[PDB]
């Protein structure tokens, strides 16, 4: 009715404060709202997609506008290695005088924040040189956000709402996505690179007024049409190019030298355009696959129904998977989040391994922040994929449709899967903790020579097979006169070998026993998080303790204290438990990356190689040592520009600590406390005339777990980000 | 009207939105602000008291000193700001005070908004302190503010000095 | 002159806008059928 949860009649009649909390918390759960049909659900999701896309482009336009208005892009272009990039200007009426002088840094004269997101290098590579270019990009993205908001409004109109058959058109949507949204966009980016970014790297000034009359190549469409495509690769940029200017430059637009530009320590811009062109052609061909309207093409139902091994090896094969995926939005979303989590972990690895933006791998602060950023986001997406698979099992899985399916057999032998994940996790934890404690006791007792240090020969063999030639394995690419080393010897090999065998890059960092131990720790974390998530997903439909768990839904508090006790029995509680393990393993990964790069950037990799084998070495050489510039941001003798990072460090500590409130103390204590406070307010004079509308009650059990988990996570992020930024900023190496 | 009444029933209940009460109040504010613009023109003319070259130090104004681009806030802007804050305090006391001698800012319990309509509001036969004539004066004042803002923005001159074109020798 | 826009917009937005949104949201919460 007129009450706030208009979508839930059950919540609107709640006389307590639980109504507001649950109405806020269940606003986006479009499947369970009152009187919801499938078509209306799909239309609302389409409109929400448009609104979210507009939010993304508004955020990017805001970044562009703030760098254009309050930034030092003009000064940073002229000297990228010595000028600090600027995020935006600071307005604070709470500042003292010394805070105003302390935050006044860079070339500007106002208090200011130094950008650690690397947007300066990215825009500098793609041809931005002035503040007007950034402002025009901000205007374009503002107009795009306006257009997307209008489109979202338009597709909820009665004559423009698409039908349910339009949404479930898998072949047409995948054809158009794979061809257009991937290949045509990659082709357009290759065109932008060749027309603007490559000439800007060579000193030419190409903008909207002269791009249509300036030839990107001296010949121009003659090597392409005649078939002499190798003319575009001749005369590349020499190894004296000096980015942004024209001395030692070339006239090539599509090359595959491989390796790094010698000055910017990033990949060649002509390699990237060639890469994008190849990906464009491949994606257009791949989008030419599924039957839409012209006879040719596949049917996705027939491919899935055909793939049955001959004699019952996988049951009934993939029969019925087409009907389950199309009719369940939770399975599609789970597949999307799993793939996106793999993708953003891949970008996290490859942007430090193979930097593409000019004059990165020398800032080190953007280099740390981007990696930690993308790894934490990867962990979040990975947990969400399994959470939505559990939701799909709870309220979207049809057992009769999936009879003897490849999906039902997963539930058939779920006990074997959970038990073997248990065995792997227990084995890894036992052994890597035993090795770490052994090294701790051996170093503590004055005998570091008694440590168990396993040399990581498999990954070192992989590095040698990629071309690294200090391990002395002499195999494949590391050994000349080999088939792999000869076949590519005149396309991309010399640049790759001169980039992999130098000590200034992050390509295939030299690894020792500490790398072995911490990789085993990472495998432990991955296997245990997978254990919790897979067990929750597979036991979401029921177990021995609760055979009818599907009747109670995905998220419910418990099943009472009977038959032993049923605390944390739902699949939502399995998500809640696996969130801690994801945070733990991402913290392990980021600690390993940050300490290894802190020792490599300072030219002191021996410190990591000697102190990473035992836990006290970590504790006293990474965390205790690198906190000194952070915690000294403000003290009894004054303050500097890292005072905000010290304050945020303590802030994240306090939020992480007050999560333990909701995680350890449970409802009953607080409900009785609330009842005493209710008596207090009702029975005091003057103040009893002020009467509440909603009866105050304690937070519910699932709500309390969510609030404590959100506190734990926010405190986790807000205590790791200031450390990983200020410790790198406080050392410059 | 009924479009905005159906769109914002909570907001249109209290007379907020495109109603006659809002437009009358905005016209009155435009009249007083035209008087304030003329008074500030006289203030720059005679130089009664405030000087706009000196700065506001931190040691006497806190964080409401240097704020924009580490740029000083001047005594003239500070004086006009203090006068505006006092006008706003009187405004809050009038809006949230006893409804004596005054048309209310909002609509009271279940009362219909007035309608002197608009169009041309006949000046002849409505002379004196009549709601239609005061309404016309406020409407003209709002249009004068819009025209002055647009003219100053186009010409690149001061808003207080773009009206000095249309006076001639006046005040400043 | 663009040196006034921080000191104008930041208080207006950050203080005035969410206060009015909190009051409006609370009123919309507690209205009934």
């Amino acid at each position: 009715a007129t009450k706030f949860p208009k979508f839930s009649q059950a919540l609107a009649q709640d006389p307590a404060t639980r109504r507001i909390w649950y109405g806020i918390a269940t606003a986006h759960d479009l499947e369970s709202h009152d009187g919801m049909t499938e078509e209306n659900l799909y239309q609302k999701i389409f409109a929400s997609h448009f609104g979210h896309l507009a939010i993304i482009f508004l955020w990017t336009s805001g970044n562009l506008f703030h760098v254009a208005w309050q930034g030092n892009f003009q000064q940073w272009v002229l000297n990228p290695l010595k000028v600090k990039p600027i995020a935006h200007a600071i307005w604070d009426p709470h500042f003292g005088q010394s805070a105003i002088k302390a935050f006044t840094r860079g070339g500007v004269s106002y208090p200011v924040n130094i950008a650690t997101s690397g947007v300066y290098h990215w825009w500098y590579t793609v041809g931005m040189r002035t503040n007007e270019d950034l402002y025009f990009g901000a205007l374009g993205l503002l107009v795009l956000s306006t257009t997307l908001l209008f489109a979202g409004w338009l597709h909820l109109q009665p004559k423009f709402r698409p039908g349910i058959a339009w949404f479930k058109n898998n072949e047409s949507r995948l054809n158009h996505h794979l061809s257009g949204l991937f290949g045509v966009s990659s082709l357009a980016w290759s065109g932008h690179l060749i027309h603007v970014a490559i000439p800007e790297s060579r000193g030419q000034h190409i903008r909207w007024n002269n791009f249509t009359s300036t030839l990107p190549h001296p010949e121009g469409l003659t090597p392409f049409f005649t078939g002499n495509w190798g003319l575009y690769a001749e005369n590349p940029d020499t190894a004296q190019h000096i980015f942004g200017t024209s001395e030692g430059a070339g006239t090539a637009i599509l090359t595959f030298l491989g390796g790094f530009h010698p000055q910017t320590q990033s990949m060649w811009l002509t390699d990237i355009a060639h890469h994008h062109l190849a990906i464009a052609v491949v994606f257009i061909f791949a989008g030419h696959m599924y039957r839409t309207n012209w006879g040719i093409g596949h049917s996705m139902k027939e491919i899935l129904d055909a793939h049955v091994p001959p004699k019952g090896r996988l049951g009934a094969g993939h029969r019925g998977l087409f009907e389950t995926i199309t009719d369940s939005l939770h399975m599609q979303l789970g597949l999307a989040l799993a793939s996106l989590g793999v993708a953003t972990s891949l970008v996290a690895q490859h942007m430090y391994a193979l930097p593409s933006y000019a004059f990165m791998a020398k800032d080190y602060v953007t280099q740390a922040a981007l990696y930690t950023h993308h790894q934490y986001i990867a962990g979040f997406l990975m947990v969400g994929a399994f959470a939505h698979g559990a939701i799909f099992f709870v309220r979207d899985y049809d057992p009769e449709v999936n009879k003897d399916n490849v999906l039902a057999r997963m539930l058939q032998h779920k006990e074997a899967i959970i038990s073997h994940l248990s065995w792997v996790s227990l084995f890894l934890g036992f052994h890597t903790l035993g090795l770490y404690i052994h090294n701790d006791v051996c170093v503590a007792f004055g005998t570091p020579e008694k440590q168990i240090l396993f040399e990581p020969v498999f990954a070192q063999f992989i590095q040698a097979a990629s071309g690294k030639a200090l391990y002395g394995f002499d195999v494949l690419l590391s050994s000349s006169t080999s088939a792999a080393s000869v076949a590519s010897s005149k396309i991309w090999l010399p640049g790759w070998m001169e980039a992999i065998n130098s000590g200034k890059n992050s390509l295939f960092l030299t690894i020792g026993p500490g790398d072995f131990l911490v990789h085993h720790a990472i495998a432990l974390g991955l296997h245990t998080t997978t254990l919790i998530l897979v067990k929750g997903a597979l036991d979401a439909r029921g177990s021995k303790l609760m055979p009818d768990k599907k009747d109670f839904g995905y998220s419910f508090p418990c099943d009472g204290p009977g038959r032993g006790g049923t605390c944390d029995i739902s699949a939502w509680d399995a998500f809640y438990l696996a969130m801690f393990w994801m945070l733990n393993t991402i913290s392990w990964v980021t600690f390993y990356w940050h300490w290894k790069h802190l020792t490599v950037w300072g030219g002191n990799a021996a410190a990591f190689n000697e102190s990473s084998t035992y836990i006290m070495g970590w504790l006293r050489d990474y965390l205790w040592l690198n906190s000194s510039p952070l915690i000294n941001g403000y003290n009894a003798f004054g303050m500097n520009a890292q005072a905000v990072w010290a304050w945020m460090f303590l802030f994240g500590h306090l939020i992480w600590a007050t999560g333990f409130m909701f995680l350890i103390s449970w409802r009953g204590y607080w409900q009785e406390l609330i009842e005493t406070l209710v008596w207090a307010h009702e029975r005091t004079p003057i103040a009893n005339l002020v009467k509440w509308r909603d009866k105050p009650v304690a937070l519910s059990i699932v709500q309390a777990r969510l609030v404590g988990l959100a506190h734990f996570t926010v405190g986790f992020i807000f205590t790791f980000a200031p450390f990983v930024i200020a410790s790198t900023t406080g050392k410059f190496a | 009207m009924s479009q905005f009444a159906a769109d914002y029933p909570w907001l249109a209940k209290y007379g907020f939105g495109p109603t006659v009460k809002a437009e009358r109040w905005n016209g009155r504010h435009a009249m007083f602000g035209w008087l304030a613009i003329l008074g500030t023109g006289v203030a720059k003319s005679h130089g009664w008291l405030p000087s706009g070259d000196v700065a506001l130090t931190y040691n006497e104004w806190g964080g409401l000193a240097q704020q924009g681009f580490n740029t000083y806030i001047t005594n003239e802007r500070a004086i006009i700001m203090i006068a505006h804050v006092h006008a706003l305090a009187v405004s809050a006391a009038a809006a949230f005070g006893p409804q004596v001698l005054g048309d209310s800012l909002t609509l009271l319990d279940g009362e219909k908004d007035e309608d002197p309509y608009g169009l041309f509001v006949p000046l002849k036969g409505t002379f004196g302190l009549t709601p239609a004539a005061e309404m016309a004066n406020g409407r003209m004042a709002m249009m004068g503010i819009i025209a002055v803002v647009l003219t100053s923005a186009i010409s690149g001159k001061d808003i207080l000095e773009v009206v000095d074109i249309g006076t001639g020798g006046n005040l400043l | 002159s663009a040196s006034f826009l921080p000191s104008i917009l930041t208080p207006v937005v950050t203080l005035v806008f969410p206060g009015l949104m909190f009051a409006l949201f609370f009123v919309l919460i507690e209205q009934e059928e």
């Binding site: 609104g51 506008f65 208005w69 956000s145 306006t146 908001l149 909820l156 | - | 919309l28």
Partner: peptide, 30 residues
């Protein structure tokens, strides 16, 4: 250097985007 007219133009575009955002949010409605 970004002029004041450019900033005010961006502010006008953002205001139009805000009104369309309100329209979309009230088209999904509560």
């Amino acid at each position: 250097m970004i002029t004041d007219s450019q900033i005010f133009f961006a502010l006008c575009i953002a205001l139009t985007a805000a009104v369309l955002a309100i329209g979309l949010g009230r088209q999904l409605y509560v």
